[PDB]
Amino acid sequence: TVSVSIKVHFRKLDFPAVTICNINPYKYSTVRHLLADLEQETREALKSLYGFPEHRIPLLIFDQVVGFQLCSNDTSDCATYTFSSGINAIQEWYKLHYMNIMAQVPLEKKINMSYSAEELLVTCFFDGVSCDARNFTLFHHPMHGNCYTFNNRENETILSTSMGGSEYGLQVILYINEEEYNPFLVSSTGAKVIIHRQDEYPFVEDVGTEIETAMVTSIGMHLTESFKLSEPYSQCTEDGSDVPIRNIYNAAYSLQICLHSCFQTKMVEKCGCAQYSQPLPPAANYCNYQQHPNWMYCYYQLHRAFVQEELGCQSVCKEACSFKEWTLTTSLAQWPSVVSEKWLLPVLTWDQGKKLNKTDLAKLLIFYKDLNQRSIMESPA
Amino acid sequence: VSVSLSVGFKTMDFPAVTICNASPFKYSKIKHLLKDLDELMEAVLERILAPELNLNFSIWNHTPLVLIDERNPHHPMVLDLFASEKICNAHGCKMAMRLCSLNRTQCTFRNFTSATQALTEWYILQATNIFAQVPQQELVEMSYPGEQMILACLFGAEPCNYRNFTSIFYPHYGNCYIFNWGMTEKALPSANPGTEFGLKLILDIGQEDYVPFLASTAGVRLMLHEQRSYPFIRDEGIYAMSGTETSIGVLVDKLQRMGEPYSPCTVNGSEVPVQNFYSDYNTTYSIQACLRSCFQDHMIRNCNCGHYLYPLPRGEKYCNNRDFPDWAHCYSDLQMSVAQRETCIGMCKESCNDTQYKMTISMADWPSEASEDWIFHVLSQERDLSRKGIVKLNIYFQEFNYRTIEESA
Amino acid sequence: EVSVSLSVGFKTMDFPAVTICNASPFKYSKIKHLLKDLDELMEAVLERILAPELNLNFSIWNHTPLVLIDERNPHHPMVLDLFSEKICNAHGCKMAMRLCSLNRTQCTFRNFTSATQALTEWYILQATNIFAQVPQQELVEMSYPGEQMILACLFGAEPCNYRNFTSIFYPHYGNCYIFNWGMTEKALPSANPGTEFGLKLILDIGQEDYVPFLASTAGVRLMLHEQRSYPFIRDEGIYAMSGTETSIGVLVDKLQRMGEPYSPCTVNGSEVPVQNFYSDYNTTYSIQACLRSCFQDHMIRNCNCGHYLYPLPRGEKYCNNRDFPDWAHCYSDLQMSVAQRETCIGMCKESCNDTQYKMTISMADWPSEASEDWIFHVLSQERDQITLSRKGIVKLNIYFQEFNYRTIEESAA
Ligand SMILES: *[C@@H]1O[C@H](CO)[C@@H](O[C@@H]2O[C@H](CO)[C@@H](O)[C@H](O)[C@H]2NC(C)=O)[C@H](O)[C@H]1NC(C)=O
Ligand SMILES: *[C@@H]1O[C@H](CO)[C@@H](O[C@@H]2O[C@H](CO)[C@@H](O)[C@H](O)[C@H]2NC(C)=O)[C@H](O)[C@H]1NC(C)=O
Ligand SMILES: *[C@@H]1O[C@H](CO)[C@@H](O[C@@H]2O[C@H](CO)[C@@H](O)[C@H](O)[C@H]2NC(C)=O)[C@H](O)[C@H]1NC(C)=O
Ligand SMILES: *[C@@H]1O[C@H](CO)[C@@H](O)[C@H](O)[C@H]1NC(C)=O
Ligand SMILES: *[C@@H]1O[C@H](CO)[C@@H](O)[C@H](O)[C@H]1NC(C)=O
Ligand SMILES: *[C@@H]1O[C@H](CO)[C@@H](O)[C@H](O)[C@H]1NC(C)=O
Ligand SMILES: *[C@@H]1O[C@H](CO)[C@@H](O)[C@H](O)[C@H]1NC(C)=O
The missing domain is CATH 2.60.470.10 (Acid-sensing ion channels like domains)
Incomplete structure (x- = not known):
């Protein structure tokens, strides 16, 4: 049996x-030369189905109901998807083909085609002192292009907050070039942000809070920790050191890292190739229509089995005993105010070195509301 | 524990x-019911927005809005909307709904300091009194499909x-x-x-x-x-x-x-008299559904009709100023009644x-x-x-x- | 236990x-009569930056002038007061406030990478130097009712x-x-x-x-x-x-x-050494009020004046360029000192x-x-x-x- 206790501290943090x-992964005019054929086919489909003025898997119509089907090789079976709206038909078909094109392009070129830190960041400001694009680390994500991480870079000491509130946290103004969005892939305009440990993989595709343009987003946060006890007391691990699954994220262990690593490994077993949405495991290739022509149906079967917990990943992976969380309080306001547009937008475009539109920009504030760090500890009796 | x-x-x-x-x-589906209430709401806005500027007085008389003016404590006074024509908005002036019963021999006021709140709450009551007379099988056809x-x-x-x-x-x-x-x-x-x-x-x-x-x-x-x-x-x-x-x-x-040996909460609804339900489906129990279901028992005992925002028994009637003239006041009494509050909170129990x-x-x-x-x-x-x-x-x-x-x- | x-x-x-x-x-319609000199100078500063090809109250400017610092030449970095004729925005150029003190004999910069933040911070400092000279019961009348x-x-x-x-x-x-x-x-x-x-x-x-x-x-x-x-x-x-x-x-x-027999927190303001400057509001104790009173004490001792954003004890005066010329320098010194922040943390008990x-x-x-x-x-x-x-x-x-x-x-x- 155990005793729980709580320790609260007020000190620089x-x-x-x-x-x-x-939200958009690549500046469209830069990738349009790869995606030209897919754009032509998509606009032909829109003109054929909906009159809009504007090859292993065609788009189809059913008794309008629009869809496509993913087929196996060694038997006649297929998984057929029929959508009651053309938006889902076109978006999902386009994303199938888009991810099977981008999986074949080399990473060295994808990193060069996506955004630079000097493009994404108009200004940065932390702890009341200047900050620059050189203070951010590159994080290339296969579905968001170049993401950039503040306060996580090698052989530099972690930045610490000695004063609470809006004026002494991270303040950053983002340029979100929405005339260069992809017409068929990306249907939402803004940015995303993850708050995480320095040694934790962000998974910015899952749980990121979303940033709206022509707006200031004020992410105030508090810090809370929990420390469980491992076996005998609970079937739990402090580290990835005693679970059978190999971690492929090059980041500190957590249950979602373990579950995704397990599933990505099961795909390299069953389908012969890795899912492009996730990091590449050792000595494997990403799936694509020309080398792995039937991987679509393989993934469908495999994920159906995963949801029914038949692959074992949910029972093999374990919860991590030490847990740290920032409890965010997102709130929004209009920015610039109608009186300040007269001078903010000209100076912001001078700081880039056309005039910026108010909807091309977003301001973000991330700060500790107070220096109170809570913690809940479990200990043997 | x-x-x-x-x-x-x-x-x-x-x-x-x-x-x-x-x-x-x-609105395109329901405005034929609300026409004579809208024509009156436009006139009620004229006497507030442009007072220097035909009515269905049967819709008005149900619960008038009144001006309550108490700037002069020696002689405070209350006036129906129907040196100037301007209704006073100053501190000390209140706009209130005159809820009444028994041929207006007893009345009570719901007070608002702001005219935008008073007009919102007046209309919603007068609209509710109309919807209560439409059968749900037809009222469901006037909403968004x-x-x-x-x-x-x-x-x-x-x-x-x-x-x-x-x-x-x-x-x-x-x-x-x-x-x-x-x-x-x-x-x-x-x-x-x-x-x-x-x-x-x-x-x-x-x-x-x-x-x-x-x-x-x-x-x-x-x-x-x-x-x-x-x-x-x-x-x-x-x-x-x-x-x-x-x-x-x-x-x-x-x-x-x-649970039971340690606390008064219940595993499912079998211990509780939740007679009235919002719909025909076999939904689970909850203390919130019990309190609402209990309120209607007391309102069907007291006011002889069930309220529109609440569930209804198998054979009873919703409240109308046609059939149940006093219902508007009678409902406001039940909201304030301590006996009603404490007896339902006593009947129902946690899950x-x-x-x-x-x-x-x-x-x-x-x-x-x-x-x-x-x-x-x-x-x-x-x-x-x-x-x-x-x-x-x-x-x-x-x-x-x-x-x-x-x-x- | x-x-x-x-x-x-x-x-x-x-x-x-x-x-x-x-x-x-x-x-603004109620305070523009104080801020007109500063607004005319701020729009002249904006014109100098944005439209340089196109008198002012330079007594406001000389308080903390913005300077360009151009380091495109590592063997000769050159610093220029704002007052083709373009200011530099290339990768080697930064923009700063010259915070000078002691008859200007020795002083330092506060640095910015971007003009939007430099102008924001400059104006906030100048407007504070103006508001600190208005009595508060009059300053209340030109705010929102x-x-x-x-x-x-x-x-x-x-x-x-x-x-x-x-x-x-x-x-x-x-x-x-x-x-x-x-x-x-x-x-x-x-x-x-x-x-x-x-x-x-x-x-x-x-x-x-x-x-x-x-x-x-x-x-x-x-x-x-x-x-x-x-x-x-x-x-x-x-x-x-x-x-x-x-x-x-x-x-x-x-x-x-x-409480104390089990942890170092407090249930009252008692036996905390910091004098509480928020006491005139009759409010209950808070670590935030203690930290701000600690800062305002250090400010009143080092600069000889109190800052505008904080309450003030009964005998003191708010900081002005007219009465306390070195105030911006010493205030930035205190505001940026992490050792000072840690001193207040080490001095205030939390509730x-x-x-x-x-x-x-x-x-x-x-x-x-x-x-x-x-x-x-x-x-x-x-x-x-x-x-x-x-x-x-x-x-x-x-x-x-x-x-x-x-x-x-x-x-x-
Ligand atoms: C929406 O409803 C349809 C049926 O109207 C569901 O389609 C069925 O899904 C099951 C699997 O769960 C299949 O075995 C059936 O053959 C499907 N029927 C038809 C006619 O296609 C559909 O799954 C539902 N979708 C959601 C998200 O609930
Ligand atoms: C942003 O990055 C720069 C460069 O790495 C950091 O600059 C150093 O800042 C410290 C004080 O914080 C100075 O003592 C060093 O001399 C600076 N180095 C250089 C090369 O200029 C800066 O601290 C970073 N800022 C933030 C907020 O992360
Ligand atoms: C602000 O920026 C200026 C210019 O980059 C800094 O001044 C230089 O500081 C270095 C290191 O002390 C000296 O070797 C140079 O001679 C300085 N140049 C000039 C023109 O003075 C200054 O240190 C920065 N100050 C702050 C607080 O960031
Ligand atoms: C007034 O409205 C009621 C409906 O509430 C209606 O029955 C009645 O006929 C109307 N009378 C007149 C004169 O419009
Ligand atoms: C309540 O929770 C327990 C958790 O094990 C579950 O067994 C039970 O079915 C739930 N529902 C009821 C009505 O008890
Ligand atoms: C400059 O402006 C200040 C107010 O900000 C004013 O008091 C002062 O007299 C002005 N100086 C001149 C020379 O006009
Ligand atoms: C502080 O916490 C204790 C905990 O028992 C509580 O009794 C007290 O009311 C709280 N508030 C104050 C102001 O002491």
């Missing part, structure tokens, strides 16, 4: 790592 | 999600449409449509966090068809709840904003109580399991300027629409999707 | 004290007025109005969850009357806090947009520790009652397009008046969630 992304 | 607290992630049934438009009715509401639906990668939703009529909000209720089909499990595996909806607000003087916020009402429970939208629901994509991360937060779905809200503009015109052409063609008439809505599990507090001996 | 316990549910209790502020400290802001209010079923709010001058945000503070009246309880039984507000931002170079963000500031506690709204507060109905669901998450008003915030457009005309026409009559617009009005609801408390408490074994 380490700042999290903050990974910021554009 | 003593508790233990835990947090984590696990495969579990996805919430039931109720989608409901903010305006209860389509499911096939116009749900433009597109996608659960992870399973396509859905308005026929995957169970329809209910919730009298405060009109038609509401429930996803994944688990009532006539097996509920869907979800085994992954993040947006890509959640529920993805595109919804039409139909803002050009709202009722002008009623339900003055634009969006969809939303509520996450248990399978087979009835959605009390008013009490734990939220709005979602049009012209945006709203992203909602879900955490299932539970309290498990120890042993107590589940609440916590939410983390985020927003972004939708569609993108590049995808806007093919998006809205496809949505226009499929109805044979504009940015601020459309909602996009994502509901998904967080990285840690449950938190539990469990009592033990 | 102490044993923790946990309690969760709904309980009837005092409704949180809500403080409302505008995002602009002043009404409760008459203008609170268009309508209604708590549960009880009507309410701007006279139900206690007024304070919070110098970074001007006038602020505190509902249910429990200071000179009995605080109101509530006993049911949901918006139907909570605080309902309609507020007017007056967005067109903002100070152009101070009020870059538009909305109200909000903060929920205990009765008889001072609202440190620049740390704790959230915003709310105009043109929307914002609904805030509150849960009171509390953590109560044992044993930790409490957090946790909020779930949701939004929707208000009024709807169908119900727009008559609502704005009627709202125009809610004041002695028309000068009203959609971009100015907030609708705001604050209420208790189904469970409105989560208390974690220590007890002696």
Whole structure:
């Protein structure tokens, strides 16, 4: 049996790592030469089905109901997807083909085609002192392009907050070039941000809070920790050191890292190739229509089995005993105010070196509301 | 007893999600009932906005608005709206509803300092008194239909449409449509966090068809709840904003109580006299449903009719100023009656399991300027629409999707 | 030894004290007669940066002039006062404020990579040097009045007025109005969850009357806090947009520790050495008030004047370029000293009652397009008046969630 106790401290406090992304992964005019054929086919489909003025898997119509089907090789079976709206038909079909094109492009070129830190960041400001694009680390995500991480870089000491509130946290102004969005992939305009440990993988595709343009987003946060006990007391691990699954994220262990690593490994077993949405495991290739022509149906079967917990990943992976969380309080206001547009937008475009539109920009504030760090500890009796 | 607290992630049934438009009715469908009340509401606005400027006085006399003027304590006075024509807004002037009973030989006032509140609450009462006279099978035909509401639906990668939703009529909000209720089909499990595996909806607000003087916020009402429970939208629901994509991360937060030997809570509803239900479905018990179901017993004893915003017995009648003239005052008495409050709170009891779905809200503009015109052409063609008439809505599990507090001996 | 316990549910209790502020400290139409010299100089500075190819009160400029520092030549970096003729914005160029002291004989820069932040900080410093010279009971009259802001209010079923709010001058945000503070009246309880039984507000931002170079963000500031506690709204507060109905669901998450024999926290202000400068508000003890009093003490001792953003003891004066010429230099020195911040942390005890008003915030457009005309026409009559617009009005609801408390408490074994 155990005794729970709580320790609260007020003292200068380490700042999290903050990974910021554009919602759109690549400046469209830069990738349009790869996606030209897919754009032509998509606009032909829109003109054929809906009259809009504007090859292993065609788009189809059913008794309008629009869809496509993913087929196996060694038997006649297929998984057929029929959508009651053309938006889902076109978006999902386009994303199938888009991810099977981008999986074949080399990473060295994808990193060069996506955004630079000097493009994404108009200004940065931390602890009341200047900050620059050189203070951010590159984080290339296969579905968001170049994301950039604050306060996480090698052989530099972690930045720590000694004063609470809006004026002494991270303040950053983001440029979100929405005339260069992809017409068929990206249907939401803004940015994303994750708050995480320096040694934690952000998973910015899952749980990122979203940043709206022509707005200031004020992410105030408090820090809370929990420390469980491992076996005998609970079937739990302090580290990834005693679970059978190999971690492929090059980041400190957590249950979602373990579950995704398990599933990505099961795909390299069953389908012969890795899912492009996730990091590449050792000595494997990402799936694509020309080398792995039937991987679509393989993934469908495999994920159906995963949801029914038949692959074992949910029972093999374990919860991590030490837990740290920043409880965010997101709130929004209009920015610039109608009186300040007269001078903010000209000076912001001078700081880039056309005039910026108010909807091309977003301001973000991330700060500790107070230096109170809570913690809940479990200990043997 | 003593508790233990835990947090984590696990495969579990996805919430039931109720989608409901903010305006209860389509004005183009219902304005023939509300015509004579609208003509009077325009005149009531003339005597407030432009006092220097034919009425149905039977609609007015039910509960007039009155000016209460007490700037001169020696002689405070109250006046019906029907050196200047101007009704006073100054400190000491109140605008109030004269609720009355027994041929107006007894009356009571509901006080407002602001005219925008007084007019909102006056109309909603006069509208309610009209809806109470329309049979629900016909009143449900004047509200937003499911096939116009749900433009597109996608659960992870399973396509859905308005026929995957169970329809209910919730009298405060009109038609509401429930996803994944688990009532006539097996509920869907979800085994992954993040947006890509959640529920993805595109919804039409139909803002050009709202009722002008009623339900003055634009969006969809939303509520996450248990399978087979009835959605009390008013009490734990939220709005979602049009012209945006709203992203909602879900955490299932539970309290498990120890039960009978240690506490007064109940395993299910079999111990409690919950006679009145909002709908014909076999929904689960909840203390909130019991208190509302108990109020109607006391109102059908006292006022001889049931209230429109509440459930109704198998053979009783809703309250009308035609059949039950005193009902407007009689209802206001029950709200204030201590005996009514304490006797229902005594009859009903807590549940042993107590589940609440916590939410983390985020927003972004939708569609993108590049995808806007093919998006809205496809949505226009499929109805044979504009940015601020459309909602996009994502509901998904967080990285840690449950938190539990469990009592033990 | 102490044993923790946990309690969760709904309980009837005092409704949180809500403080409302505008995002602009002043009404420009009422304060432009002080700021005209600084505004003319700020627009000349903007012209010098943005349109250089195209007299001024240089006594304002010479207080802390902005300089370009150009390091494109590592063997000859050159620093130039703002006053083709283009200022540099290339990768080697930065922009700074020259903070000089001691008859200007020895001084330092404060550095910025971007002109937008340099101009923001320069103007805030200059405007503070102007506001610090106005007596506060006159400075209150050129900020936003409760008459203008609170268009309508209604708590549960009880009507309410701007006279139900206690007024304070919070110098970074001007006038602020505190509902249910429990200071000179009995605080109101509530006993049911949901918006139907909570605080309902309609507020007017007056967005067109903002100070152009101070009020870059538009909305109200909000903060929920205990009765008889001072609202440190620049740390704790959230915003709310105009043109929307914002609904805030509150849960009171509390953590109560044992006192001195078991932990170093305090239940009173007693035996803390710092003199409390917020005592004239009669508010309860708080670590935030102690830290700010500690800073203001160091400021009054080192600079010989007190800073404008903080309260002031009875004999002292606020810092002015006229009376205390070195004040900007020594204030930046103190403001940036992490050792000084740690000294105050090492000097103030924190309170044993930790409490957090946790909020779930949701939004929707208000009024709807169908119900727009008559609502704005009627709202125009809610004041002695028309000068009203959609971009100015907030609708705001604050209420208790189904469970409105989560208390974690220590007890002696
Ligand atoms: C941003 O990055 C720069 C360069 O790495 C940091 O610059 C150093 O700052 C410290 C003081 O904080 C100085 O003592 C060093 O001399 C600076 N180095 C250089 C090369 O200029 C800067 O601290 C970083 N700022 C933030 C907020 O992370
Ligand atoms: C929406 O409803 C349809 C039926 O109207 C569901 O389609 C069925 O799904 C099951 C698997 O769960 C299949 O075995 C059936 O063959 C399907 N029927 C048809 C006619 O296709 C669909 O799954 C529902 N979608 C959601 C998200 O609930
Ligand atoms: C502000 O920036 C200036 C210019 O980069 C800094 O001044 C230089 O500091 C280095 C290191 O002490 C000296 O070797 C140079 O001679 C200085 N140049 C000039 C023109 O003075 C200054 O240190 C920075 N100050 C702050 C507080 O960031
Ligand atoms: C007034 O309205 C009522 C409905 O509430 C209707 O029955 C009646 O005929 C109307 N009378 C006139 C004179 O319009
Ligand atoms: C309550 O929770 C327990 C948890 O194990 C579960 O077994 C039970 O079915 C739930 N429902 C009821 C009505 O007890
Ligand atoms: C400059 O402006 C200040 C106010 O900011 C004023 O007091 C002073 O007299 C002005 N100086 C001159 C020379 O006009
Ligand atoms: C502080 O915490 C204790 C915990 O028992 C509580 O009794 C007290 O009311 C709290 N507040 C104050 C002001 O002491």
